[PDB]
Design a protein around this ligand. Structure first.
Ligand SMILES: *[C@@H]1O[C@H](CO)[C@@H](O[C@@H]2O[C@H](CO)[C@@H](O[C@@H]3O[C@H](CO[C@H]4O[C@H](CO)[C@@H](O)[C@H](O)[C@@H]4O)[C@@H](O)[C@H](O[C@H]4O[C@H](CO)[C@@H](O)[C@H](O)[C@@H]4O)[C@@H]3O)[C@H](O)[C@H]2NC(C)=O)[C@H](O)[C@H]1NC(C)=O
Ligand SMILES: CC(=O)N[C@H]1[C@H]([C@H](O)[C@H](O)CO)O[C@@H](P(=O)(O)O)C[C@@H]1O
Ligand SMILES: *[C@@H]1O[C@H](CO)[C@@H](O)[C@H](O)[C@H]1NC(C)=O
Ligand SMILES: *[C@@H]1O[C@H](CO)[C@@H](O)[C@H](O)[C@H]1NC(C)=O
Ligand SMILES: *[C@@H]1O[C@H](CO)[C@@H](O)[C@H](O)[C@H]1NC(C)=O
Ligand SMILES: [Ca+2]
Length: 388
């Protein structure tokens, strides 16, 4: 078994085609299904798995009540083959209320974080064994990607951050080999805030589109040099803009260099990826809430500041249904490396007050160079049938 080096062109894509859906919440009304949030997907070189951070309880369980909280000692990282729902036979891989996993070609890496907010700890579990750990460096909630990491030639990269949510913070990029931290680089370039990065290979580098929870509704970009460990950061050029809350396609901007300061506070994990000068991206259909989800191509949205020439749009979830986080994952084809994405469909507490829990389902698409149609694929549950 050789290490993944991901050195193949990026497949030319025309849009994305449906790929998987787990119908988690619908099943929960008549089955024992894990309560989860912040899910994601990653594939080794043979099959794809679906991860999620559970809430140490099933839905039809009094313990689900008040699962709106993001960090309790009972959250663990669940892992199943893509498509099999989180039922009782699912393996809890580690203790973690924030995580990230990737396969380097020979084994899985799982960075798991738990602990007190002011003094959390992250364990780096590789190939089944705990190989290394690190502690909070800014005593204020050590957090990471919430999506897949990436490895080239045996070296994996995971961007992490400790600090303020809506304030300056400390973002570093750990370089890990076989579970062992072999280098740590600090964020450089012009990105103000970096959280929940959605990274992907780009031989010989890795590129990420993250979340700015402080001053920007445009998304930050983090470029990682696997060779010398140098970092660089910017914001995506597109004037279309992918964070939530955001401005309005009409009155929204991005200069490629700084937080646009337009409805900058708060956000949502998301993705985007480059294609020559164009950019592929997705985002909630609403600008205020996490409702609906669409994807499209912004002609010259990677290279030219403020571009808004959109085309090839697809609605994944209609504007009347809930969505949530979302991220990207790469799969190696025979001749090129393709890009896919999943989208979390949060249901429950916060927006929906009939029930007392909070959970999610998922729907996942992959790029295609072929043809495709139209549709919409939401969570699907009826809050009125649900327990609680
Ligand atoms: C964030 O998380 C880290 C890692 O857990 C915490 O650091 C550890 O803190 C504990 C508690 O202080 C350390 O364990 C204790 O070590 C003491 C000795 O260290 C001092 O004294 C020696 C004397 O030779 C010096 O060499 C050394 O430099 C220190 O000055 C022990 O005395 C402690 O035992 C006593 O206290 C405990 C309660 O604290 C009692 O219950 C015991 O009965 C006993 O009386 C204890 O063993 C530990 O070593 C630290 N880690 C490391 C790597 O050093 C942080 O405290 C935490 N931060 C926050 C904000 O929560
Ligand atoms: C480690 C951690 O707490 N992650 C949480 C993250 C942070 O709150 C923001 O990243 C602020 O920095 O966001 C929430 P969200 O529902 O969007 O509010 C879900 C995550 O559990
Ligand atoms: C990438 O890996 C394959 C085998 O895994 C090898 O044939 C190819 O030459 C490698 N390319 C680089 C740039 O390492
Ligand atoms: C859920 O918890 C709250 C307080 O923790 C309580 O008031 C409420 O009645 C609970 N409801 C159910 C249905 O468990
Ligand atoms: C991966 O390995 C090949 C073969 O050893 C090497 O030439 C290539 O540059 C490596 N790539 C990176 C990004 O280290
Ligand atoms: Ca923001």
């Amino acid at each position: 078994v050789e290490y993944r080096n991901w050195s193949k062109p990026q497949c030319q894509i025309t849009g994305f085609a449906p790929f998987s859906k787990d119908n988690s919440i619908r099943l929960s009304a008549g089955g024992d299904i894990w309560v989860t949030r912040e899910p994601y997907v990653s594939c080794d070189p043979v099959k794809c798995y679906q991860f999620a951070l559970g809430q140490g309880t099933t839905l039809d369980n009094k313990h689900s009540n008040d699962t709106v909280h993001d960090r309790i000692p009972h959250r663990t990282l669940l892992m199943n083959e893509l498509g099999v729902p989180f039922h009782l036979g699912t393996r809890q891989v580690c203790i973690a209320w924030s995580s990230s996993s990737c396969h380097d070609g020979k084994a899985w890496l799982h960075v798991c974080i738990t602990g007190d907010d002011k003094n959390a700890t992250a364990s780096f579990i590789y190939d089944g064994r705990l190989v290394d750990s690190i502690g909070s460096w800014s005593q204020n909630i050590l957090r990471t990607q919430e999506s897949e990491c990436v490895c080239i030639n045996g070296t994996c990269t995971v961007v992490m951050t400790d600090g303020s949510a809506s304030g300056r913070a400390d973002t570093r990029i750990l370089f890990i080999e076989e579970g062992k931290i072999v280098h740590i680089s600090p964020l450089a370039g012009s990105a103000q805030h970096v959280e929940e990065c959605s990274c992907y290979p780009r031989y010989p580098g890795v590129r990420c589109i993250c979340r700015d929870n402080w001053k920007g509704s445009n998304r930050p970009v983090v470029d990682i040099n696997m060779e010398d460990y140098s970092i660089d950061s910017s914001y995506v050029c597109s004037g279309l803009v992918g964070d939530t809350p955001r401005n309005d396609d009409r009155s929204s901007n991005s200069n490629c260099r700084d937080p646009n300061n337009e409805r900058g506070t708060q956000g949502v994990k998301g993705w985007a990826f480059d294609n020559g000068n164009d950019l592929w991206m997705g985002r909630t259909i609403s600008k205020d809430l996490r409702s609906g989800y669409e994807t499209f191509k912004v002609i010259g949205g990677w290279s030219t500041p403020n571009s808004k020439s959109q085309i090839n749009r697809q609605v994944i979830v209609d504007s009347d249904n809930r969505s949530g986080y979302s991220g990207i994952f790469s799969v190696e084809g025979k001749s090129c490396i393709n890009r896919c994405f999943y989208v979390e469909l949060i249901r429950g507490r916060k927006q929906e007050t009939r029930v007392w829990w909070t959970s999610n389902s998922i729907v996942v698409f992959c790029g295609t160079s072929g043809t495709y149609g139209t549709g919409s694929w939401p969570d699907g549950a009826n809050i009125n049938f649900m327990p609680i």
